[PDB]
Amino acid sequence: PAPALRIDYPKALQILTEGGTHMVCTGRTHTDRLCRFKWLCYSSEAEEFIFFHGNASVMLPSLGSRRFQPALLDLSTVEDHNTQYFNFVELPAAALRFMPKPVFVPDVALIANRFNPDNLMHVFHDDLLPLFYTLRQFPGLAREARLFFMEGWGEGAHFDLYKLLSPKQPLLRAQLKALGRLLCFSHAFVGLSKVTTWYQYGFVQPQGPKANILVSGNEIRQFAHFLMEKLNVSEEYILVFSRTQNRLILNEAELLLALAQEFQMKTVTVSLEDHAFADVVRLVSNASMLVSMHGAQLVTALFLPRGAAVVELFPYAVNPDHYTPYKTLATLPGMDLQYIAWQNTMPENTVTHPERPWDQGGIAHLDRAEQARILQSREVPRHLCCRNPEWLFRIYQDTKVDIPSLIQTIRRVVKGHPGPRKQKWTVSLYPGKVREARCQASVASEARLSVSWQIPWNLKYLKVREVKYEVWLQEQGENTYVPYMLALQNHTFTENIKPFTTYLVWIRCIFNKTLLGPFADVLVCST
Amino acid sequence: APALRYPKALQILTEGGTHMVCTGRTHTDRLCRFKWLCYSSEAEEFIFFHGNASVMLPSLGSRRFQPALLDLSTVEDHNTQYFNFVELPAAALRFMPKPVFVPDVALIANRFNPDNLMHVFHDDLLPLFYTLRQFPGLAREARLFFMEGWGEGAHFDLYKLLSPKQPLLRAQLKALGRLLCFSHAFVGLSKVTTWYQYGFVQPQGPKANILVSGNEIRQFAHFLMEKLNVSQEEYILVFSRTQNRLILNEAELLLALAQEFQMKTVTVSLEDHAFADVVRLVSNASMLVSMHGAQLVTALFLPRGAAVVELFPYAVNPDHYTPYKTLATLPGMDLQYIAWQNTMPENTVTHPERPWDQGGIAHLDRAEQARILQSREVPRHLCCRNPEWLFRIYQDTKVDIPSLIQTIRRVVKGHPGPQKWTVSLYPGKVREARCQASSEARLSVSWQIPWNLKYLKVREVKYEVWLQEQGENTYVPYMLALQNHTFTENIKPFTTYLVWIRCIFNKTLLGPFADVLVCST
């Protein structure tokens, strides 16, 4: 039994009225900024956060007019999206005399914007994963924070997933007008980290993977482990993730039997509509292979066990290489998932729906000349977000899957039985710097350059399959080097080494060809 | 407990491994929160242990060495102040000594130059103060770990005021144990409070985009004053040096200042006064006069409205060396700044026989010595030990009184020192921006005042309007006093115009643009 401590109202009102708002934020740009506020206020009538200047006020960063070029920070994880900015208006703390008495929020708050709470992929990629690790950026937040979703949408189809990310009930912006005309957070954090994102949806360039992905499969799976425990989720089979409303697999029944016979495994169907989400996660987490049309439901592939296979199907005229949010997820370093893409290339096996509304892929609202152009094109061109008619027209086709071509496409990657072979998922880490690098000239001989060094310190405690040392030889005063790949820690160079010459020697250790370590301090050596 | 050599801790470490979550896009603005980060005192390497609960955000791959994970000092991208770790599986602890655990939460950072007062305040104290306040619980509980490798330095007592717990230096970790393991540690310092760069790539000068204002400097100074028991008759304060860079006619300077401003004058120095007494003297000075030097960083303790008079030796252009000019003229600092330069060779004293440390030139080739002696202004240069710069900056100076008084009087007319201080805030967006269309084309626009202006009294309120024709990448600007306008000049029918509106307080406080107003004629 813990005390249900409320706010000490006279004390809080005095600290607010005399001291004012306090703000300390990270990062130097608005696209990578997280803010810690004390005594930040919000008027539910104006729908504006308020910074009150008092005698203890702090504003870091202090941007001046730059606070509106474009704003203070991104409230959502979609970078620089001009409808998801956060900012406040300023008033002197004395101006509280002209306002109703404030209502204080005792809970520590995390304020953020959900991008599209109706799409499972946006929920996981833009909100759930960023929230999970943003909370763990600051001590105490993970156990105490109440989420405040200010984007303006309702609960959405997946609100129960948002409730798993916090012990307290999250609040929407529309609910704040009932709490009071002037609300003041005693302790609030604002913003979401972009560190877990891997996709951009096509606002400035055609959609695709983020340029520099900073998340690995291990961090994805730690998040999945948490959600599975929250959902109370603790005969090998193939799982077909079905859709019931649009973008259908028209011969799903034939597909289930064909996969069952080809791989000699039980096949099972799952869908968002007919299964509770905890049951969906339960089925995915033990599946050896996940087969599904391109769509939001494939984001659940992050729950797949290591070693499982993802088979993504694409409708006619949809190039798999151009739409890769689930390919990128499946092939992240550390995810350890096989990825297979299959595209319908037979026009007799596709079903178009030109009469539907525009948001469902219809084209009847366009002029007859443009409809014929869309109908005659056999691949969606590269485009920008969000309502490209040809993209929607083709992505909401129904598909008859050519069974033998799908089987052969899978077999080029899954040569035998699918799923984990109970493999040893070794950790992949990098060497340290080589230590104590020394060098010597000849001991009337040729020109000789002999170099030696000690192994990296962490290699003292490592068992590694292949250890090599890349050595760069740069002659004094020249801008070019000669590379060497060596296995030993002691080498004497002779070929093309000149007498009475000084060389710059750079050394770095490499594990298994691809894991490059850092270079040590440069070694200067004369022959 | 400061140290501990708990089976729960060893098992959490051996099973789960290290946990890392960091902010920032690049290594130059990254702060990291670590759990179970470890350090080998023998190898002087931090260690990330890969366990079954390990997290590495960001996961940089090989890019973790281009050039490192983060900056350990607030000097940007300095190739000797990098932080990084080496990796091992958590099971490798079988072949390592029994770890000694640091139970207190830690903040790990590098001091750039703990022997220079300016470097102490600018690079370390201010960044430490606000980095601790970036994360809950740090300001009251953190133990500071300085890893740059220096000793205490002359100002180590100032670092102790930022923390109730005893700080530890890297050389002191060796005695703690061969393998040290932090249960909770933060790494890095924010650069948000910095305002100067010391000339590593381009010549030294102000930071390109300064993100700190005088209000944040003064909140930090207020905290330090209470830690020094400095509580809260007008006088002018001359901040003298006793070893080098002397004012040769100091006694006559004190008399001439006291007569010119009809005000008491008093001296102070770092050598002859306890630092708490130095702060007490500066905090009520109406004017601070001193040679260019580290002691002028104490100007951040001056009361609002006081004047800073910085004197420069012969051949030292004040415009090239502006760390204290930048500090004094920061927005919100409310300090007047005056620079005076000695331009008479008969009033300067050189010391060519001193070590390189103190500006001697006797260790150089005779041809280089002749160049330095014959040059009348120190050229622009990069860090760190330029001989001509050190030779002139350690000159002694006889201050020409009539020229200095005239220089001060161009900035300080009348009495120096403190006035009422309004904080300058910005307008909100204009609200409910509507428009009407019209022949000859006509376009009417109107809007409501920003919400915060409902509660403000402002001397001058104007509205800037950008008129952009849809399909053109340019605009026509207008400055209005009313909340409405009707455009007729160069307005066309069958055209779509985009209207951008922002409000401006007192000419210079530009507010944000509202959402674009699309009006078609």
Ligand SMILES: O=c1ccn([C@@H]2O[C@H](COP(=O)(O)OP(=O)(O)O)[C@@H](O)[C@H]2O)c(=O)[nH]1
């Ligand atoms: O037959 C369907 C079609 C869609 N959805 C879900 O409804 C949301 C919106 O679907 P949409 O097609 O707009 O998103 P997409 O799948 O193209 O990302 C997503 O969470 C889908 O998984 C569903 O459950 N069944």
Ligand SMILES: O=c1ccn([C@@H]2O[C@H](COP(=O)(O)OP(=O)(O)O)[C@@H](O)[C@H]2O)c(=O)[nH]1
């Ligand atoms: O006569 C002197 C000369 C220097 N210093 C202090 O000693 C440190 C190192 O001086 P240096 O000249 O290297 O720094 P500078 O003043 O040029 O920044 C600084 O904290 C100075 O304030 C001092 O107290 N008295």
Ligand SMILES: *[C@@H]1O[C@H](CO)[C@@H](O)[C@H](O)[C@H]1NC(C)=O
């Ligand atoms: C602000 O006001 C409080 C209450 O009077 C006072 O204790 C404090 O010294 C003032 N100044 C600052 C910088 O907090």
Ligand SMILES: *[C@@H]1O[C@H](CO)[C@@H](O)[C@H](O)[C@H]1NC(C)=O
């Ligand atoms: C799922 O089934 C059982 C546990 O329910 C487990 O033995 C099996 O390995 C799991 N599937 C995979 C692919 O690991």
Ligand SMILES: *[C@@H]1O[C@H](CO)[C@@H](O)[C@H](O)[C@H]1NC(C)=O
């Ligand atoms: C190889 O061994 C050591 C390096 O550890 C070095 O002293 C020795 O001279 C090397 N051999 C040569 C340079 O022939």
Ligand SMILES: *[C@@H]1O[C@H](CO)[C@@H](O)[C@H](O)[C@H]1NC(C)=O
């Ligand atoms: C890690 O190991 C602990 C103890 O062995 C166990 O409780 C936990 O489930 C494992 N997995 C994760 C993801 O922590």
Ligand SMILES: *[C@@H]1O[C@H](CO)[C@@H](O)[C@H](O)[C@H]1NC(C)=O
């Ligand atoms: C100020 O006095 C208090 C004792 O109550 C203490 O914080 C500290 O030792 C003193 N500081 C100085 C500089 O005298």
Ligand SMILES: *[C@@H]1O[C@H](CO)[C@@H](O)[C@H](O)[C@H]1NC(C)=O
């Ligand atoms: C502090 O400074 C004020 C401002 O000029 C002045 O009254 C005097 O120098 C000091 N007052 C004290 C110590 O009470």
Ligand SMILES: *[C@@H]1O[C@H](CO)[C@@H](O)[C@H](O)[C@H]1NC(C)=O
């Ligand atoms: C235009 O704005 C002024 C104040 O700026 C106001 O007095 C006037 O009534 C407004 N006119 C219209 C037509 O709204």
Ligand SMILES: *[C@H]1O[C@H](CO)[C@@H](O)[C@H](O)[C@@H]1O
């Ligand atoms: C809006 O646009 C996004 C990005 O293309 C889609 O993922 C979403 O389904 C909706 O079409």
